[PDB]
Amino acid sequence: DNTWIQAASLTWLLLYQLISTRIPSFASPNGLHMREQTIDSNTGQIQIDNEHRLLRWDRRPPNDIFLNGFIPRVTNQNLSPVEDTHLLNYLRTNSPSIFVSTTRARYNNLGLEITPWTPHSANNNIIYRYEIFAPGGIDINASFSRNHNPFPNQDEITFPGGIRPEFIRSTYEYHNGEIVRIWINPNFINPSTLNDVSGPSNISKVFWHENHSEGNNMDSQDFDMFAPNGEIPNNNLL
Amino acid sequence: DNTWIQAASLLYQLISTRIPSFASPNGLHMREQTIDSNTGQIQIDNEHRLLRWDRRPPNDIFLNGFIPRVTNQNLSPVEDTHLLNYLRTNSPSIFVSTTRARYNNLGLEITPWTPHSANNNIIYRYEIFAPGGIDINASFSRNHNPFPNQDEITFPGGIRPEFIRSTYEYHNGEIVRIWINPNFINPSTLNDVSGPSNISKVFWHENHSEGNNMDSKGFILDLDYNQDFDMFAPNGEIPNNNLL
Amino acid sequence: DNTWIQAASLTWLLLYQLISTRIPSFASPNGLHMREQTIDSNTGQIQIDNEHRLLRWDRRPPNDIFLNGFIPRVTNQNLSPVEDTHLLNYLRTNSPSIFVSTTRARYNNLGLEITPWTPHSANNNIIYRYEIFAPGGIDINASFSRNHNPFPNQDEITFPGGIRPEFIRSTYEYHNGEIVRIWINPNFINPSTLNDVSGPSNISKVFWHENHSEGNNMDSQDFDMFAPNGEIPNNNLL
Amino acid sequence: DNTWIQAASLLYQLISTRIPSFASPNGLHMREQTIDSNTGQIQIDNEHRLLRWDRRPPNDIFLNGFIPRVTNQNLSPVEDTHLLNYLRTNSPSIFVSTTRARYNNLGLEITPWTPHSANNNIIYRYEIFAPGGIDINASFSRNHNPFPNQDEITFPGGIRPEFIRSTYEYHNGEIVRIWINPNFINPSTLNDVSGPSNISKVFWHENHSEGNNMDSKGFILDLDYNQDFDMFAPNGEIPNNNLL
């Protein structure tokens, strides 16, 4: 099915084979594998659990994100389908593509959240930690080998065509490594769960709305999700 | 819209994108008025009449139509959609070639681009009326090959049988039979099928007994067939401008 | 062992890695497989049998070939390694490389020679049919799938770095599709077998020597070995 | 010769062919006089003294030396030998970085390029004398990409332990011990190992009890080690020109 790009922010988004067959076995032996169970086999609804919780470190404010969602750097229909669907090259060099990266949320064997892959620049200035629950996505870990190239972040889940805002539940607004606010996306696909949004105590849990006054705080875009620009610092709880 | 590939049995950008500005100054150009703007019924006229020289019998063609050498199960998009490389080397692709039917300024048919091997053994001259197709002549000048066929129309994804109206069965350069495709898209015109007098005008039907006459080689399944061989530019030319 | 490039005419010739890794799974499922049993594990000599007999259609005369052997189009130690060791690109487009192509000689189940992959231009002007017995070579058939890019001549054996003259036993000189002479390489690696050189009766079996007067007949180089430029016409005997 | 990779554990070409003539007009330049003209002895002087800030203990380093993040095992020559990409992003490669040791016009050592994290936890300051290495400063422009400390010397294939003479063990920015590599290539000079007074000058030996002190992160085996982190241009700088 095409559940695999079902969250695509690109309306105008063969493409499987376009990406998939440009790959060496050295890099992707078994091959390109995808995310199974992103959507309830029963309802055709978005699976909202810890196993499928995803995150994206971005320096762009919700006024943009909660509005437009995550749109790939290659945004036009007149793309050079060729350089722009080259997964390995994207994963290796972070060259502009139709891909949008996210990282699995991490938990201990108790179901308690532990540190996730984190950008090295995380403690500097304004960066956001978006929470995503979306259908499909490429399981980088299952598609490639850990010591070989393009040396990606195994906890990575790549979304060809990006992700629509409706799949972004919330985001933490950090200022110099300190949580400052917790935003909630009223428009999230399954609002019944807007309640479950975890977060620190004594930190304003605001509800985003278009053109929100404080939803546009940012430094004076795929950079912090680039493998070499981060790592899983530790396995400590949060 | 999507007419350029309606005959088939992103993809656009995938093609048009690897085309040098010096390769096709004007850029990719598609056959115009291939269907009625009203009906959306194929434009079954002389302007849009197309032909394909093939050595495969109707039992195959009238059944499966023209299927590219590269199907969806063995496709490598970056390459298998490389038009210039297909046109220049005849490497396996998703493309299927045809040549415009030729007419004088009186509407009388004259010799079309013809394979050099035409007078040897069994070859078929299929008649096609299909939607879309790339106008090679309009897309390139006499510069996609050293020996251009100004008359080619390429169909990405091939052509379905319903667009193949008829075919002439040749044996050593001599018409032997004229086949008609009962399943042709617009049967009302099956009547207009021109052809020589005193030559059996048979009606094809699946597994027809005499609809499988072909050169020995096509039967040595062991070895692949460059079924696109006789449509390859260097393997033919427009011999003359004589009437038929 | 670096035998797969042993016969290399390229003097200055990681290289096995450089070529193989770039190859896609779709093309090379089991990946690059080098010819085996090419040399006596006993006598340490070139295995000179029908199984390992190879041929190369070339339009260059023996005065060149028997002298220099087959030197790749990319012959200079200062090569741009990346565009010049790309096998798939060579096999698909015939772009200049360090590779030299040959085709297996064909035999029926009786050991009788049958038609080999033949250039379409074979019947036009002067072309030569060189006979080779050399160590190593890439088994294209074993490395790639059929009806799959680069749709290489499965009967093909590719030699990175080319082949040295000492591995070229003989060659047929054709003039408009007709054998005119049969040349013998006195310098062939195993002269004891110069005797076994088969060929039509009533056709001069000359012995080549440098600057030979009639060893330079040619039309007024990897073209005729390019997949699309030929095919196995039939399975008839010779 | 092959001196420029002689300290290791087509390639030159693999590297040179991917460095635009803009960034590197005169091209790649390897250090020279790394080895002695006559003898073959490594040049053990101040001009050729090199250092590498690493968080891995001698029990590893003095044993295995500096092995690139990419071995021949998991090597993909096109990308794993991309110098500029390594220098710009610190992506895994076959390269191992070191920085020139700094001296005033009196021959007195002054502050070298130092990691910003230097004052935090356990980090080591290894002393190296090895053959070859790429002279980053001579190969690239500082008014150009990718702005690595021109004091860098890159070693394709890494460096063998025998070229690492000593190392300072720091704990929260304070020297705690000075290790000596008995196996150093030229033991006659193990004597010349400078260092602060009142700081234990230990002699390393395999599996040494205190030769394995390192930050907690390196024990998380399920997680991959970015060992080249503190040698990455943006992660450090030459703080000052003060003496030591």
PDB file of C-alpha atoms in Angstrom, chain B residues 51-164:
ATOM      1  CA  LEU B  51       3.224   2.186 -37.392  1.00  0.00           C
ATOM      2  CA  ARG B  52       5.524  -0.282 -35.710  1.00  0.00           C
ATOM      3  CA  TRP B  53       7.690  -2.820 -37.474  1.00  0.00           C
ATOM      4  CA  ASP B  54       7.851  -5.904 -35.296  1.00  0.00           C
ATOM      5  CA  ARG B  55       8.779  -9.535 -35.926  1.00  0.00           C
ATOM      6  CA  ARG B  56       6.318 -10.846 -33.331  1.00  0.00           C
ATOM      7  CA  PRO B  57       3.002 -12.283 -34.543  1.00  0.00           C
ATOM      8  CA  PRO B  58      -0.462 -10.934 -33.710  1.00  0.00           C
ATOM      9  CA  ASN B  59      -1.196 -13.888 -31.419  1.00  0.00           C
ATOM     10  CA  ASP B  60       1.206 -12.067 -29.113  1.00  0.00           C
ATOM     11  CA  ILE B  61       0.700  -8.455 -30.116  1.00  0.00           C
ATOM     12  CA  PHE B  62      -3.089  -8.357 -30.548  1.00  0.00           C
ATOM     13  CA  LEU B  63      -3.215 -10.099 -27.186  1.00  0.00           C
ATOM     14  CA  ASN B  64      -0.611  -8.341 -25.027  1.00  0.00           C
ATOM     15  CA  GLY B  65      -0.089  -5.166 -27.061  1.00  0.00           C
ATOM     16  CA  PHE B  66       3.385  -3.619 -27.042  1.00  0.00           C
ATOM     17  CA  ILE B  67       5.050  -4.138 -23.686  1.00  0.00           C
ATOM     18  CA  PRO B  68       8.375  -2.406 -23.048  1.00  0.00           C
ATOM     19  CA  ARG B  69      11.496  -4.486 -22.545  1.00  0.00           C
ATOM     20  CA  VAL B  70      11.488  -3.224 -18.952  1.00  0.00           C
ATOM     21  CA  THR B  71       8.254  -4.017 -17.030  1.00  0.00           C
ATOM     22  CA  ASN B  72       7.439  -2.660 -13.546  1.00  0.00           C
ATOM     23  CA  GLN B  73       8.922  -5.807 -11.898  1.00  0.00           C
ATOM     24  CA  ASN B  74      12.424  -5.232 -13.274  1.00  0.00           C
ATOM     25  CA  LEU B  75      12.567  -1.461 -13.423  1.00  0.00           C
ATOM     26  CA  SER B  76      15.483   0.732 -12.326  1.00  0.00           C
ATOM     27  CA  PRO B  77      14.003   4.167 -12.861  1.00  0.00           C
ATOM     28  CA  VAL B  78      17.125   6.347 -13.105  1.00  0.00           C
ATOM     29  CA  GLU B  79      18.221   4.309 -16.116  1.00  0.00           C
ATOM     30  CA  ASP B  80      15.237   2.487 -17.557  1.00  0.00           C
ATOM     31  CA  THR B  81      13.728   5.911 -18.212  1.00  0.00           C
ATOM     32  CA  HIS B  82      16.827   7.338 -19.871  1.00  0.00           C
ATOM     33  CA  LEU B  83      15.335   8.392 -23.182  1.00  0.00           C
ATOM     34  CA  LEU B  84      18.501   9.569 -24.919  1.00  0.00           C
ATOM     35  CA  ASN B  85      20.314   6.398 -23.969  1.00  0.00           C
ATOM     36  CA  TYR B  86      17.411   4.335 -25.347  1.00  0.00           C
ATOM     37  CA  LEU B  87      17.318   6.358 -28.547  1.00  0.00           C
ATOM     38  CA  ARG B  88      21.097   6.275 -28.907  1.00  0.00           C
ATOM     39  CA  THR B  89      21.766   2.583 -28.001  1.00  0.00           C
ATOM     40  CA  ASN B  90      18.471   0.719 -27.931  1.00  0.00           C
ATOM     41  CA  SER B  91      19.262  -0.391 -24.370  1.00  0.00           C
ATOM     42  CA  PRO B  92      16.292  -1.971 -22.571  1.00  0.00           C
ATOM     43  CA  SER B  93      13.797   0.622 -21.369  1.00  0.00           C
ATOM     44  CA  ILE B  94      10.177   1.423 -20.601  1.00  0.00           C
ATOM     45  CA  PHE B  95       9.870   2.966 -24.051  1.00  0.00           C
ATOM     46  CA  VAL B  96       8.172   1.530 -27.110  1.00  0.00           C
ATOM     47  CA  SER B  97       8.879   3.071 -30.497  1.00  0.00           C
ATOM     48  CA  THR B  98       6.578   3.738 -33.432  1.00  0.00           C
ATOM     49  CA  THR B  99       6.981   5.699 -36.617  1.00  0.00           C
ATOM     50  CA  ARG B 100       4.563   8.146 -38.236  1.00  0.00           C
ATOM     51  CA  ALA B 101       2.755   6.838 -41.316  1.00  0.00           C
ATOM     52  CA  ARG B 102       3.733   8.925 -44.371  1.00  0.00           C
ATOM     53  CA  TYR B 103       1.532  10.770 -46.870  1.00  0.00           C
ATOM     54  CA  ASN B 104       1.989  13.052 -49.869  1.00  0.00           C
ATOM     55  CA  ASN B 105       0.292  16.436 -50.211  1.00  0.00           C
ATOM     56  CA  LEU B 106      -2.685  14.610 -51.684  1.00  0.00           C
ATOM     57  CA  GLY B 107      -3.360  12.390 -48.690  1.00  0.00           C
ATOM     58  CA  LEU B 108      -1.877   9.383 -50.460  1.00  0.00           C
ATOM     59  CA  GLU B 109       0.314   7.069 -48.416  1.00  0.00           C
ATOM     60  CA  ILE B 110       4.007   6.998 -49.308  1.00  0.00           C
ATOM     61  CA  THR B 111       6.870   4.887 -47.968  1.00  0.00           C
ATOM     62  CA  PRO B 112       7.415   5.150 -44.214  1.00  0.00           C
ATOM     63  CA  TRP B 113      10.632   4.695 -42.218  1.00  0.00           C
ATOM     64  CA  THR B 114      11.471   1.081 -42.981  1.00  0.00           C
ATOM     65  CA  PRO B 115      13.759  -1.431 -41.296  1.00  0.00           C
ATOM     66  CA  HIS B 116      16.637  -2.559 -43.488  1.00  0.00           C
ATOM     67  CA  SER B 117      15.773  -6.191 -42.730  1.00  0.00           C
ATOM     68  CA  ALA B 118      12.216  -5.690 -43.936  1.00  0.00           C
ATOM     69  CA  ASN B 119      12.668  -7.920 -47.010  1.00  0.00           C
ATOM     70  CA  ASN B 120      14.013 -10.832 -44.993  1.00  0.00           C
ATOM     71  CA  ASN B 121      11.808 -13.458 -43.411  1.00  0.00           C
ATOM     72  CA  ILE B 122       8.709 -12.755 -41.330  1.00  0.00           C
ATOM     73  CA  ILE B 123       8.129  -9.218 -40.074  1.00  0.00           C
ATOM     74  CA  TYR B 124       4.875  -7.400 -39.225  1.00  0.00           C
ATOM     75  CA  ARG B 125       3.783  -3.833 -39.939  1.00  0.00           C
ATOM     76  CA  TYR B 126       1.400  -2.883 -37.130  1.00  0.00           C
ATOM     77  CA  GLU B 127      -1.057   0.009 -37.404  1.00  0.00           C
ATOM     78  CA  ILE B 128      -1.572   2.057 -34.285  1.00  0.00           C
ATOM     79  CA  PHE B 129      -3.860   4.876 -33.164  1.00  0.00           C
ATOM     80  CA  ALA B 130      -3.151   5.718 -29.528  1.00  0.00           C
ATOM     81  CA  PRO B 131      -3.217   8.629 -27.139  1.00  0.00           C
ATOM     82  CA  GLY B 132      -0.139  10.696 -26.302  1.00  0.00           C
ATOM     83  CA  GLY B 133       3.382   9.606 -27.151  1.00  0.00           C
ATOM     84  CA  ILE B 134       6.509  11.727 -27.293  1.00  0.00           C
ATOM     85  CA  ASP B 135       7.056  13.675 -30.500  1.00  0.00           C
ATOM     86  CA  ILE B 136      10.707  12.859 -31.039  1.00  0.00           C
ATOM     87  CA  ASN B 137      10.893  15.250 -33.953  1.00  0.00           C
ATOM     88  CA  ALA B 138       9.581  18.119 -31.812  1.00  0.00           C
ATOM     89  CA  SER B 139      11.701  17.187 -28.825  1.00  0.00           C
ATOM     90  CA  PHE B 140      15.085  16.932 -30.562  1.00  0.00           C
ATOM     91  CA  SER B 141      16.464  18.164 -33.820  1.00  0.00           C
ATOM     92  CA  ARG B 142      18.346  15.735 -36.151  1.00  0.00           C
ATOM     93  CA  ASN B 143      20.599  15.506 -33.106  1.00  0.00           C
ATOM     94  CA  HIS B 144      19.458  12.758 -30.642  1.00  0.00           C
ATOM     95  CA  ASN B 145      21.179  10.228 -32.922  1.00  0.00           C
ATOM     96  CA  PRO B 146      23.610  10.606 -35.848  1.00  0.00           C
ATOM     97  CA  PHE B 147      20.853   9.060 -38.004  1.00  0.00           C
ATOM     98  CA  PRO B 148      17.622  10.495 -36.688  1.00  0.00           C
ATOM     99  CA  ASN B 149      14.221   9.152 -37.556  1.00  0.00           C
ATOM    100  CA  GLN B 150      12.303  12.460 -37.728  1.00  0.00           C
ATOM    101  CA  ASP B 151       9.302  10.377 -37.649  1.00  0.00           C
ATOM    102  CA  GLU B 152       9.393   8.566 -34.311  1.00  0.00           C
ATOM    103  CA  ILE B 153       6.773   8.624 -31.602  1.00  0.00           C
ATOM    104  CA  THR B 154       7.851   7.075 -28.318  1.00  0.00           C
ATOM    105  CA  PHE B 155       5.450   5.571 -25.829  1.00  0.00           C
ATOM    106  CA  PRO B 156       6.607   5.318 -22.232  1.00  0.00           C
ATOM    107  CA  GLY B 157       4.945   2.222 -20.770  1.00  0.00           C
ATOM    108  CA  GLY B 158       4.204   0.795 -24.217  1.00  0.00           C
ATOM    109  CA  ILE B 159       0.816   0.555 -25.913  1.00  0.00           C
ATOM    110  CA  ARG B 160      -2.277  -1.557 -25.142  1.00  0.00           C
ATOM    111  CA  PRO B 161      -3.639  -3.959 -27.797  1.00  0.00           C
ATOM    112  CA  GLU B 162      -6.880  -2.011 -28.082  1.00  0.00           C
ATOM    113  CA  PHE B 163      -4.877   0.710 -29.886  1.00  0.00           C
ATOM    114  CA  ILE B 164      -3.482  -1.596 -32.537  1.00  0.00           C
TER     115      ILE B 164
END
